[PDB]
């Protein structure tokens, strides 16, 4: 987009700095905030990934929840050693959505459905 | 199976209470903003008990209602305590539920999979408003009479059916004894429906668990409910009791209008008619329009937007901690809602017409704007990636 | 639309074919990269198109055991250009049927439909064979299927005995497993299959074969797609030798009380396989002469119930369940033997009877001439009737071009069948009983003699 | 696929209107 | 400050996954030039040409048809008969199957041993099979030796004889054959379905017959039956492959004699005592079995009814699924998609059986005892959605599949001769390919809806179940699931 990019717009670099600061202070990546109960396609995208990546995801989530309960933040060195925005989930999610659309176009039933609450 | 019994708390008799109160798993980083549901439950119970004991000394007739309330306060042992608890616990109950709603708005608790909970909450809010308004009448003062007149005659603005439904509602040609007795029966009935809706609300929440100040998956680190959140609820309850009793014992009339100590007189009108302090935002939105049909049908967008928030389906991050712009919009909406509240208690002239017409515009731009962040931010991973 | 015994009014009819149609000739075409394109024309409205590769279960190092079973299972799935959904849904769109198969020596892919769909069939087949991608989740699904089948793959004792024979009686590449085992299954993933395919599906080892397609169509369609495979010289074939051996596994104790049958077999070899042509058809007619029979069938009286073995074993001995005879003529080598199931006590007696039958066949002077002519006629009729289907014809073209380089016609084979005499069968049997003996037992085995007792009866 | 659904919707609307004119019987309308 | 993207285990694996997803991205048009997944309707006029079917009725009324093609080296000859298991009296029920088993062992001119040694010496073989309305004896032979096969057929049909010890050994082997028909249970389910959907009528009976009857089946019954039902007009002589029509008609006029000339046609035996579909259920409960099998069926069309084409299109668009198939969850029809995605069955197979004056049309699934109600729900949902809102891609795909199946099944000489004989007995004529196509592509969505409303919508059903079926919904559930209250 012409104005979403941080390269050409000065009101997006500030946004990414804020988000990166808030993600680092708890030590978790931007793709960790996607929930498998929310979209029901994140569930498949995560189901198809290798085991070690998902295990690292679970460990990071537990670390952040412990930090929040204790009301503190990671030390400065373990804050320097942090990389948010290093995705592991975008491409698989896009691929799953592409197959979903292509199956919808040519007739075809859905593969999994949200449950009525 | 366990071919011999172990515990009373896992037997069939206590299975429901155990599973849904004692052993239920909750996130371990819930803060103090998660106690107001239980606190509101206790407020509802207080209202019900106090009312069942007031209704043993009150007579619903136009000749007797005022004198029976004063008889309660002057001639029954401790009756002043009952009346003050009731008339101030209504205000406490509204305060607590407002804080509950704004908690839900902050950490974005309406999104999937928790929109049934939000819809049932909105229905509960409607029942609460109806019950309080119907029950502000039976003392039969000046404001009771004239507030009933204004609000229930606001229903003749509707096309052709208007006068018919107003006359059927009033039971006659004006607000008189029939309306009083009718409203008393409705007031005694509605809170039990409120109880049923509350229990359904809780079941709907327990079928997926609660959110947390982070808005992430939370199935790896959970703790039971007892004794870890029971003690936190206890702290909340004791602080609430101190506050409630400061209201009851040392300032029991600050939260009311003085004019309700004058018996109803249909001929003279008060110079400044307003309802209670917790209907003033709706009242200001309602008088903000110079048209009856528009004024009445502007409340409908309020409830439609409150009931249609959950069904926007692009936003991916729930908590406002990682969403600066939506956080700022939340605070600005709070300020605007307080401004409506203050305006709803003023005379209708300059300079209050403009300041009563713009805040509704802001209150609707809130429910219009939020999907735009949804879309514009769905594509955020692709731009900021490292 | 009237009832179906009233012709529809406005239908358009085509031009009927004459009563006599001149047969077509197989046309073989080779490309500079080494790939061969064959074809043929048939009167039927349906065209069968195949694809065959020289790769197989013997080109398996110790690291990639059981890869060909999955290559059979991962046949027509997500490719580089279209998904599994696309492949299935196009194939159903035109109405065609698609299959695949694997054996110890060569791979096969098949696709047949009506004749107006040739370019689509060729394009889909070449895409699904040449440019596959092995995503992990599909492979995991197939591996789960394979393990679930292996958990119940003991219902077929005949293939079990065949695999046991090919294990014990051989020691080289031909001893590799075809139906895989659990360790390789735990060891397999996408990368292994990808490397296997990349290494072994080269240009010189591929050949198309059409059974209802005029040559120009298939040639002009397959030139743009199949002319890009790079040139590489065919690596040499591995080595297998025939040795003696023995294998034994008494059935599970969960089957003993029910009166579990006994299953055992024998084996021999011939030094030259399909390259010893006149030897191969002598072996085939010998197989028909011995024949076989399960005695539990009710089919037509012409299915071989006057073979030597049936007449001289089953009409006399009621203990037997099913006698038989098989063969396996690979490239450059072959296998002949006998396999029988019967009551569990009658085992060494069955060994005696089988030994006597093989000995009687071996020596010269015991075989009647009318029996020889009967076997010759039955063989000729059977092969002529087998060549009638279109799929069998396509398979014949593909395998023959893979093994020789040119389709040797039916006349050659029939003339070779005419070249059988009692001296020739006697000589072939004498060559057959001059090799180590192989045994493989399964069932109630603790009553079975050892390899010593049954090797003692025969020669070296 | 649209025609059958929309026809059924129109007929269900007719049924709803008939029910309304059963519960209320106004000759002034 | 942070580690490079290669320093940790999970980063490397993530990069590998993204590399593969990258190498899946862009396709190549030259591999996507001629095929599309969207079904279309196409004309096949310029390939459907085929040789002629010369039919020559004779003064004795014995039709003779051949499909002459003079390039092959084999040919097949057979005698299809318009008699079967429908035309018995419930006191001689299995007489047809017994007669089939016995006709191969008489022929005084050549004893049994002579028969099989003679047929084996030339290298050919002959078979025989029967059903409720037809009986077949055909010989597959070499081209040079057709006249011998025709002589064998004529002699075995005409001058057969039956012996008492022959009768005894045959009844013993047939009692055995009955004893091993019980281990597969698909024919058991179908026998029960046919004996409850058609109770109190000739189609109710089974082909084998009661064991109460196989014991008392002496030669008198066989002779009376063969003299009554094996008549001159009720037979057709067919032959395909490398034969000539005129030679064949010569020796047919020469050898086929002595046939009983009775004025009894099949139509005037079916006209009285027709088939009446009632609607019932049989539930066999054992509970020691691991799997449950059941079938649910409506009524159907006749052979000459014009709607049988639409019924076959419907059966094609309600296709079959199996746990070892290559489709999986992408298999076109919605019923197969539901069963495959939700994993609620082992296999399902819609069927369509035609007859003269009646028929059947059903599903027949098999599954575990803890998924039976979901399976039944999906089955009935799709069966009714056909009558409500049939789509268009579905119908085009089903028509394509039916065309391909019908033509691809014809391959060889045995299928061709079997086609000729069967069609000459059912339609009274052989449908060409062009007329069959022109009828098949004349079924549209509207015709599907109309025929479904005629046959499916709110009609009775017949059920037959066996095994652990304690969770199978009762009859009222199935009966009420034949209409939708939302329309
Ligand atoms: C026989 C089996 C007994 C048993 O199972 O024990 C369970 C359990 C103890 O189990 P345990 O394992 O055997 O004991 C272990 C601990 O040592 C037990 O220690 P503990 O920590 O559980 O005990 C704490 C408890 C100690 O008290 C007691 O439990 C005994 C009394 O403290 C309270 O109960 C506080 C009283 C609540 C009043 C608060 C009212 C709020 C505002 C009131 C209105 C304001 C307007 C003015 O008992 C309790 O926990 C008591 C729970 C009480 C909560 C009930 C909620 C009442 C709210 C209704 C008020 C609505 C307003 C009405 C007007
Ligand atoms: C207006 C809004 C109405 C609600 C539904 C909206 C709608 O149009 O839905 C169409 C829906 C039709 O479904 P359908 O597809 O036609 O039915 C075949 C299904 O596909 C079949 O699909 P299914 O297999 O899921 O089953 C269909 C389902 C239909 O519903 C559903 O599919 C689920 C919907 C949830 C609601 C369930 C109720 O089945 C039922 O209708 C079952 C009815 C059971 C209720 C009867 C109560 C039995 C208890 C006995 C009395 C107890 C007292 C004893 C005390 C205890 C002592 C021990 O509703 C209608 O039947 C339309 C007719 C409406 C006429 C109402 C008359 C108005 C006058 C007042
Ligand atoms: C003041 C006058 C008011 C009059 C009524 C006004 C109504 C205005 C409401 C406007 C908002 C739009 C509502 C649309 C509802 C359905 C929208 C929807 O998305 O449903 C679909 C969804 C599941 O479908 P999905 O999986 O997403 O699609 C699959 C595609 N392959 O379905 C779900 O996700 C299930 C969610 C269920 C939760 C919502 C249930 C309804 C709300 C409950 C409140 C009612 C309770 C009342 C109790 C007392 C009754 C008197
Ligand atoms: C709001 C609920 C509707 C109540 C209402 O409109 O009542 C008006 C009328 C019933 O009372 P009404 O007919 O006016 O009696 C006077 C006789 N001259 O309405 C009627 O006549 C019939 C009301 C039926 C609709 C009720 C909907 C609830
Ligand atoms: C009005 C009369 C309604 C009667 C209320 C029936 C009782 C409510 C059920 C209470 C409950 O705990 O249900 C839990 C339900 C999830 O149920 P489930 O996923 O199947 O697993 C639960 C295992 N016991 O979670 C739920 O979703 C509760 C159901 C939501 C309430 C909808 C009620 C609509 C009726 C109006
Ligand atoms: C969701 C929010 C719902 C809140 C509902 C009530 C909002 C506040 C209602 C209110 O009336 O507060 C204003 C209060 C009244 O002032 P008052 O003197 O009674 O009116 C003039 C008559 N002489 O005057 C006060 O200043 C009391 C303070 C009340 C809380 C602050 C109000 C915010 C706006 C004040 C500045 C503008
Ligand atoms: C009598 C009135 C009410 C009662 C008794 C009540 C009670 C509760 C309780 C006990 C909980 C779970 C415990 C907790 O999270 O604190 C809860 C959750 C919730 N309530 Fe209510 N509530 C009431 C009114 C409302 C209203 C009016 C709304 C919205 C307009 C609402 C929205 C919600 C939401 C969104 C949650 C989700 C909690 C989460 O995100 O974890 N509630 N309620
Ligand atoms: C069974 C339940 C209830 C009963 C029997 C009851 C009974 C009564 C009675 C008899 C009065 C008149 C006495 C007086 O005004 O001093 C009254 C007044 C009132 N009630 Fe209730 N009540 C119940 C529940 C509630 C609830 C749940 C609410 C609010 C959510 C409520 C709000 C009010 C209010 C605001 C008044 C006005 C009193 C005043 O302002 O002086 N009541 N109630
Ligand atoms: Zn039989």
Question: What this model shows, in words?
Answer:
- It is classed as plant protein.
- The entry lists the keywords Complex, mitochondria, electron transport, membrane protein, plant protein.
- The entry is titled "Cryo-EM structure of Arachis hypogaea bc1 complex".
- The structure is cut from a larger assembly and holds chains A (117 residues), B (386 residues), C (460 residues), D (29 residues) and E (487 residues).
- In chain A, 19% of the residues are buried.
- Helix content of chain A is 56%, strand content 0%.
- Chain A has 117 residues and is an all-alpha fold.
- The longest helix of chain A is centred in the middle third of the chain and has 20 residues, at 51-70.
- Chain A is globular, with a radius of gyration of 18 Å.
- By secondary structure, chain C is of the alpha+beta class.
- Helices cover 40% and strands 15% of the residues of chain C.
- Chain C contains 16 helices and 13 strands.
- In chain C, strands 7, 8, 9, 10, 11, 12 and 13 form a seven-stranded mixed beta sheet that branches. In chain C, strands 1-2-6-3-5-4 form a six-stranded mixed beta sheet, with helices on both faces.
- In chain C, strand 10 (326-329) and strand 11 (334-337) form a beta hairpin.
- Chain C is globular and about 70 Å long.
- Chain D is mainly α.
- Chain D is 76% helix and 0% strand.
- Chain D is built from one helix and no strands.
- Chain D has one helix spanning 2-23.
- Chain D starts with a helix and ends in a 6-residue tail after the last helix.
- Helices cover 40% and strands 15% of the residues of chain E.
- Chain E has 487 residues and is of the alpha+beta class.
- In chain E, the strands form two sheets. In chain E, strands 7, 8, 9, 10, 11, 12, 13 and 14 form an eight-stranded mixed beta sheet that branches.
- The A-B interface holds A 1, 4-6, 12, 15-16, 18-20, 22-23, 26, 28, 30-39, 58, 61-62, 64-66, 68-69, 83-87, 90, 114, 117 and B 27-29, 111-116, 204, 207-208, 212-218, 220-221, 316-318, 321-322, 324-325, 376, 379-386.
- The complex binds cardiolipin (2 copies), 1,2-Distearoyl-sn-glycerophosphoethanolamine (4 copies), protoporphyrin IX containing FE (HEM) (2 copies) and zinc ion (ZN).
- Residues 47-48, 51-52, 54-55, 58, 69, 83, 86-87, 90, 93, 128, 131-132, 135-136, 138-139, 187-188, 191 of chain B line the site of one protoporphyrin IX containing FE.
């Amino acid at each position: 987009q012409s104005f979403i990019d941080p390269k050409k717009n000065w009101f997006a670099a500030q946004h990414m700095k804020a988000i990166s600061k808030r993600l680092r202070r708890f030590g978790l990546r931007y793709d960790d905030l996607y929930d498998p109960y929310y979209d029901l396609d994140v569930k498949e995208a995560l189901n198809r990934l290798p085991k070690e990546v998902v295990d690292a995801r679970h460990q990071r989530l537990k670390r952040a929840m412990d930090l929040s309960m204790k009301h503190e933040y990671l030390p400065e060195d373990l804050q320097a050693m942090q990389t948010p925005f290093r995705g592991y989930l975008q491409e698989m999610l896009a691929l799953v959505k592409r197959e979903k659309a292509e199956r919808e176009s040519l007739g075809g039933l859905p593969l999994y459905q949200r449950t009525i609450p | 199976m366990r071919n011999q019994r172990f515990s009373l708390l896992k037997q069939p008799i206590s299975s429901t209470l155990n599973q849904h109160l004692i052993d239920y798993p909750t996130p371990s980083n819930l803060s103090y903003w998660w106690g107001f549901g239980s606190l509101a439950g206790i407020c509802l119970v207080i209202q019900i008990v106090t009312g069942v004991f007031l209704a043993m000394h009150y007579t619903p007739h136009v000749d007797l209602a005022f004198n029976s309330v004063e008889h309660v306060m002057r001639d029954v042992e401790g009756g002043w305590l009952l009346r003050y608890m009731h008339a101030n616990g209504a205000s406490m109950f509204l305060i607590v539920v407002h804080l509950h709603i704004f908690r839900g708005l902050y950490h974005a608790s309406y999104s999937s999979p928790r929109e049934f909970v939000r819809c049932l909450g909105v229905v509960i809010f409607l029942l609460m408003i109806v019950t309080a308004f119907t029950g502000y009448v039976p003392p039969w003062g000046q404001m009771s009479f004239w507030g009933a007149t204004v609000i229930t005659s606001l229903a003749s603005a509707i096309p052709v059916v208007g006068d018919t439904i107003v006359t059927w509602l009033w039971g006659g040609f004006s607000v008189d004894n029939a309306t009083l007795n009718r409203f008393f029966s409705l007031h005694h009935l509605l809170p039990f429906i409120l109880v049923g809706a509350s229990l359904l609300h809780l079941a709907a929440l327990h079928q997926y668990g609660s959110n947390n100040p982070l808005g992430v998956h939370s199935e790896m680190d959970q703790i039971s409910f007892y004794p870890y959140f029971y003690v936190k609820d206890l702290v909340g309850w004791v602080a609430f009791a101190i506050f409630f009793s400061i209201w009851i014992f040392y300032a029991p009339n600050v939260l009311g209008h003085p004019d309700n100590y004058i018996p109803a007189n249909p001929m003279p009108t008060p110079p400044h008619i307003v309802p209670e302090w917790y209907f003033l935002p709706i009242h200001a939105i309602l008088r903000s329009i110079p048209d009856k049909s528009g004024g009445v049908a502007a409340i409908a967008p309020v409830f439609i937007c409150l009931l249609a928030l959950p069904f926007f389906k692009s936003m991916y991050v729930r908590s406002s901690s990682f969403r600066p712009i939506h956080q700022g919009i939340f605070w600005l909406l709070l300020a605007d809602r307080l401004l409506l509240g203050w305006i709803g208690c003023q005379p209708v002239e300059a300079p209050f017409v403009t300041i009563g017409q713009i805040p509704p515009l802001v209150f609707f731009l809130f429910f219009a704007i939020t999907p735009i962040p949804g879309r514009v931010g769905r594509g955020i991973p692709n731009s900021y990636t490292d | 639309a009237p009832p179906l015994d009233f012709p529809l009014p406005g239908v358009t009819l085509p031009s009927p074919l004459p009563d006599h149609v001149a047969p077509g000739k197989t046309i073989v075409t080779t490309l500079p990269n080494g790939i061969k394109l064959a074809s043929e024309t048939s009167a039927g409205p349906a065209a069968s198109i195949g694809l065959y590769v020289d790769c197989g279960s013997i080109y398996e190092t110790p690291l990639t055991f059981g890869a060909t079973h999955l290559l059979e299972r991962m046949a027509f799935k997500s490719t580089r250009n279209r998904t599994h959904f696309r492949v299935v849904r196009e194939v159903e769109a035109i109405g065609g049927n698609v299959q695949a198969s694997a054996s110890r020596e060569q791979m096969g892919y098949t696709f047949d439909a009506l004749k107006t769909h040739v370019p689509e069939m060729v394009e889909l087949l070449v895409d699904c064979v040449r440019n596959p991608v092995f995503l992990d989740w599909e492979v995991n699904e197939q591996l789960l299927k394979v393990k679930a089948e292996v958990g119940e793959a003991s219902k077929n004792p005949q293939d079990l005995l065949l695999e046991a024979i090919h294990s014990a009686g051989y020691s080289g590449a031909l001893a590799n497993p075809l139906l895989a085992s659990e360790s390789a299954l735990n060891g397999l993933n996408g990368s292994i299959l990808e490397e296997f395919v990349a290494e072994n599906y080269t240009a010189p080892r591929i050949v198309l074969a059409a059974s209802g397609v005029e040559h120009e169509e298939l040639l002009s369609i397959a030139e743009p797609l199949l002319s890009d495979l790079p040139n590489v010289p065919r690596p040499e074939e591995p080595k297998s030798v025939y040795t003696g051996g023995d294998y034994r596994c008494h059935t599970e104790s969960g089957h003993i009380l029910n009166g579990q049958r006994t299953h055992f077999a024998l084996a021999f070899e011939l030094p030259g396989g399909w390259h010893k042509l006149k030897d191969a058809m002598v072996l085939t007619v010998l197989q028909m002469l011995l024949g076989g029979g399960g005695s539990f069938s009710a089919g037509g009286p012409g299915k071989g119930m006057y073979s030597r073995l049936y007449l001289r074993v089953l009409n006399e001995y009621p203990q037997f369940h099913s006698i038989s005879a098989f063969n396996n003529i690979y490239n450059n080598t072959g296998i002949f033997g006998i396999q029988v199931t019967t009551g569990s006590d009658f085992v060494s007696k069955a060994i005696d009877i089988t030994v006597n039958e093989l000995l009687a066949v071996a020596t010269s002077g015991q075989v009647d001439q009318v029996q020889l002519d009967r076997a010759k006629q039955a063989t000729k009729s059977a092969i002529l009737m087998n060549l009638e289907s279109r799929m069998v014809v396509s398979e014949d073209i593909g395998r023959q071009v893979l093994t020789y380089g040119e389709r040797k016609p039916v006349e050659d084979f029939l003339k070779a069948v005419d070249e059988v005499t009692l001296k020739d069968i006697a000589s072939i049997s004498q060559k057959l009983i001059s090799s180590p003996l192989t045994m493989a037992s399964y069932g109630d085995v603790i009553y079975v003699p050892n390899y010593e007792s049954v090797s003692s009866k025969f020669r070296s | 696929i649209q025609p059958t659904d929309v026809k059924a919707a129109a007929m269900w609307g007719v049924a709803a209107a008939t029910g309304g004119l059963y519960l209320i019987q106004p000759w002034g309308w | 400050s942070p580690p490079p993207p290669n320093a940790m285990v999970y980063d490397r694996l993530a990069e590998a996954v993204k590399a593969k997803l990258r190498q899946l991205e862009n396709p190549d048009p030259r591999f996507l030039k001629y095929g599309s997944p969207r079904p279309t309707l196409t004309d096949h006029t310029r390939i459907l040409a085929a040789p002629e079917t010369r039919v020559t009725t004779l003064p004795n009324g014995l039709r003779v048809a051949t499909e002459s093609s003079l390039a092959a080296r084999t040919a097949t000859v057979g005698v299809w008969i318009d008699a079967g298991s429908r035309f018995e009296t419930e006191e001689s029920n299995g007489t047809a199957h017994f007669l089939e088993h016995m006709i191969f062992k008489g022929t005084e001119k050549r004893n049994a041993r002579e028969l099989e040694e003679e047929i084996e010496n030339m290298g050919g073989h002959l078979n025989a099979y029967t059903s409720r309305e037809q009986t077949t004896y055909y010989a597959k032979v070499a081209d040079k030796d057709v006249p011998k096969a025709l002589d064998i057929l004529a002699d075995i049909l005409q001058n057969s004889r039956f012996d008492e010890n022959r009768i005894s050994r045959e009844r013993d082997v047939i009692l055995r054959e009955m004893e091993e028909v019980e281990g597969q249970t698909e024919e058991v389910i179908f026998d029960h379905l046919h004996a409850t959907a058609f109770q109190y009528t000739p189609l109710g009976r089974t082909i084998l017959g009661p064991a109460q009857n196989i014991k008392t089946i002496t030669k008198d019954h066989l002779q009376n039956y063969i003299q009554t039902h094996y008549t001159a007009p009720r037979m057709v002589i067919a032959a395909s492959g490398a034969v000539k029509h005129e030679d064949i008609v010569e020796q047919v006029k020469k050898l086929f004699t002595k046939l009983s000339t009775d004025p009894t046609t099949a139509s005037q035996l079916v006209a009285k005592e027709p088939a009446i579909f009632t609607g019932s259920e049989v539930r066999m409960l054992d509970d020691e079995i691991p799997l449950a099998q059941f079938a649910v069926a409506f009524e159907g069309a006749s052979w000459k009814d014009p709607d049988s084409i639409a019924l076959m299109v419907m059966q094609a668009m309600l296709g079959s699924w199996n746990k070892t198939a290559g489709g999986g969850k992408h298999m076109g029809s919605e019923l197969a998609q539901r069963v495959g995605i939700n994993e609620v069955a082992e296999s399902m197979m819609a069927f369509n059986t035609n007859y003269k004056d009646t028929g059947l049309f059903g599903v027949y699934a098999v599954a575990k005892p803890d998924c039976l109600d979901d399976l039944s729900y999906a089955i009935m949902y799709e069966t009714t959605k056909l009558a409500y809102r049939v789509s268009d891609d579905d119908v085009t795909r089903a028509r394509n599949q039916l065309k391909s199946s019908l033509l691809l099944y014809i391959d060889g000489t045995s299928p061709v001769a079997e086609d000729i004989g069967r069609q000459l007995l059912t339609y009274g004529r052989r449908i060409p390919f062009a007329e069959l196509f022109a009828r098949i592509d004349a079924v549209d969505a509207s015709t599907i809806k109309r025929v479904a409303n005629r046959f499916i919508y709110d009609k009775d059903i017949a059920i037959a179940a066996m095994g652990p079926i304690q969770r199978l919904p009762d009859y009222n559930w199935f009966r009420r699931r034949t209409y939708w209250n939302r329309y």
